[PDB]
Amino acid sequence: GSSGSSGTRGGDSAAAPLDPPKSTATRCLSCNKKVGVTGFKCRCGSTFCGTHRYPESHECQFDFKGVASGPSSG
Ligand SMILES: [Zn+2]
Ligand SMILES: [Zn+2]
């Protein structure tokens, strides 16, 4: 057996999916990868990694400037 503990309190959390107070973290929205701070915020608010930071890579839910087209992957 071993001893140890880790926890944070406050209003740091910037983006996170609908989850209970049991635990909260920051990960990508497509690869659910630990992005923490390095994460790249998007117009939709969500947080992605340096791989899915761009919109074209991740179907941005937030309607860009309202107008919508929906680019299909040939
Ligand atoms: Zn990602
Ligand atoms: Zn987005």
Side-chain angles (χ1 to χ4, degrees):
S2 300
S3 191
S5 200
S6 72
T8 59
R9 284 160 186 278
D12 165 83
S13 193
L18 201 156
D19 270 278
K22 88 183 271 280
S23 62
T24 59
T26 283
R27 311 190 176 81
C28 198
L29 177 64
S30 279
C31 74
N32 286 78
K33 181 187 169 168
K34 178 85 186 86
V35 297
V37 62
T38 63
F40 308 81
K41 207 84 153 210
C42 193
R43 324 200 150 277
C44 48
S46 284
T47 319
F48 309 67
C49 64
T51 303
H52 299 117
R53 76 198 210 80
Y54 323 82
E56 59 187 90
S57 270
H58 85 266
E59 295 183 76
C60 206
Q61 282 297 314
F62 170 60
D63 275 307
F64 294 136
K65 274 179 278 288
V67 68
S69 286
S72 286
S73 181

